[PDB]
Design a protein around this ligand. Structure first.
Ligand code: HEM
Length: 123
């Protein structure tokens, strides 16, 4: 009654900071709306990642464990990539962590972020 039947959908997301509720800078890197692919009731979120060379790690939590996202495809001419992960409950705010490395300025950082999916946006 409540599930999404198998299919390739769209869903809008916004990225929030790890411990604060504020738009996250990742909103200018992670592109919405994400693609949403359903197979056997396995909900898969996938989207484009720009400036992909500086986002050298991107993980979201899976079953208590922060797990590194699955790159589906890359574009080296763009300096972007396409990543995928599963989200079982899209109501809950998805936890994620990104490591940002910008070698020339010696910027090496690791941040907490969270994804907020808009259910009413599915199509
Ligand atoms: C691809 C390039 C960059 C990305 C993706 C990035 C991303 C982020 C993220 C996600 C955060 C914390 C979470 C948030 O604000 O939503 C953050 C914090 C911050 N960033 Fe960057 N950043 C980049 C480059 C830079 C550069 C070049 C500087 C300065 C030269 C900078 C200065 C800062 C500062 C001062 C903070 C606050 C740190 C704290 O209070 O803990 N960022 N960045």
């Amino acid at each position: 009654a409540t599930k999404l039947a198998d299919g390739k959908y769209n869903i809008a997301f916004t990225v929030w900071k790890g411990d604060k509720d504020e738009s996250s800078r990742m909103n200018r890197y992670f592109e919405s709306p994400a693609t949403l692919t359903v197979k056997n009731g396995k909900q898969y979120v996938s989207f484009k990642v720009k400036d992909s060379t500086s986002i050298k790690s991107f993980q979201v939590e899976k079953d208590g464990q922060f797990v590194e996202t699955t790159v589906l495809s890359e574009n080296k001419k763009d300096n972007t990539r396409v990543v995928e992960f599963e989200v079982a409950d899209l109501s809950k705010k998805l936890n994620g962590k990104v490591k940002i490395n910008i070698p020339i300025i010696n910027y090496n950082a690791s941040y907490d972020i969270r994804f907020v999916f808009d259910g009413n946006s599915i199509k």
